[PDB]
């Protein structure tokens, strides 16, 4: 056991640019059409479409520089420190902003279904004013350690652009904060809100008129089903870095292949809002 080696598979240097280009194409068409239909021609009517517009804006921001990840998957990062920092900071702000928009979607659905009578002012207030200061401003202030720490390496091989940390404990606390911000706390909020939604909707089985819950339920379920195995992979990697799972270097190579492939497959939430807009599902 000399050290821990690094090796990327030759199939992941062709399949991952294919997946990145597919997601980039469907994201750029879908989010451009969604922006040009709702946010420009004033077509949006329901209260959740403002949140879907914000989600499509963050989705467009991630999709427009997904080609840099597509080039990085097969080539080396000859773009620079500025482009590496910018790609990382807008990937982080998109990945947190989409989660916070989905939490706000579930909160608006809870305020509309449970408080059906006395909630028209705070639904509109959540639609216009506090959504910025509760979704974007925590996301912009939560990505300044991504702004500081992310750099491009000057290693003679592969010129890697990644979030570079001083020691291995910083990787652990940042991955745990990544999990606790992306999956655990908003998943708890969304699950509790939807449990209260169904518990108060089963008391009102005598009238069945609204089915705007199905679209948001499908969107949230598809988002979490897309992002779940990447969170499992980074949780297993984080517990590997604690020297708890001492099951060999080959496990730490399989985990790092799984993380990359599953992150490429979990970028497929870019075609989730406009695909659900086209299908009306």
């Amino acid at each position: 056991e000399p050290c821990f080696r690094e090796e990327n598979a030759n199939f992941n240097k062709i399949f991952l640019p294919t997946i990145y280009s597919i997601i980039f194409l469907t994201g750029i068409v879908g989010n451009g059409l969604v922006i040009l239909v709702m946010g420009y021609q004033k077509k949006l009517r329901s209260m959740t479409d403002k949140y879907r517009l914000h989600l499509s804006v963050a989705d467009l921001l991630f999709v427009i520089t997904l080609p840099f990840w597509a080039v990085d998957a097969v080539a080396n990062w000859y773009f620079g420190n500025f482009l590496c920092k910018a790609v990382h900071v807008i990937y982080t702000v998109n990945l947190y902003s989409s989660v916070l928009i989905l939490a706000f979607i579930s909160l608006d659905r809870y305020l509309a279904i449970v408080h059906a009578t006395n909630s028209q002012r705070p639904r509109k207030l959540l639609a216009e004013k506090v959504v910025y200061v509760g979704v974007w401003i925590p996301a912009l202030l939560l990505t300044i350690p991504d702004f500081i720490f992310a750099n491009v390496s000057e290693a003679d091989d592969r010129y890697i652009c990644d979030r570079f940390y001083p020691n291995d404990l910083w990787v652990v606390v940042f991955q745990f904060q990544h999990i606790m911000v992306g999956l655990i706390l908003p998943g708890i909020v969304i699950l509790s809100c939807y449990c209260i939604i169904i518990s108060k909707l089963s008391h009102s089985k005598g009238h069945q008129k609204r089915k705007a819950l199905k679209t948001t339920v499908i969107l949230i379920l598809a988002f979490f089903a897309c992002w779940l195995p990447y969170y499992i992979g980074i949780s297993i990697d984080s517990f590997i870095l604690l020297e708890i799972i001492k099951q060999g270097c080959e496990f730490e190579n399989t985990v790092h292949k799984w993380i990359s492939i599953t992150e490429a497959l979990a970028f497929f939430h870019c075609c989730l809002n406009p695909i659900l807009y086209a299908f009306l599902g």
């Binding site: 056991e1 000399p2 050290c3 821990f4 690094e6 390496s153 290693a155 890697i160 990644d162 979030r163 570079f164 940390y165 001083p166 020691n167 291995d168 910083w170 990787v171 940042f174 991955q175 870095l241 790092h256 993380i259 990359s260």
Partner: peptide, 20 residues
Amino acid sequence: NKTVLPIMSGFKFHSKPVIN
């Protein structure tokens, strides 16, 4: 003391040297 690439400790391409 066996060594590795020095300050490669991040989200990806992170390693760990072996002490003597």
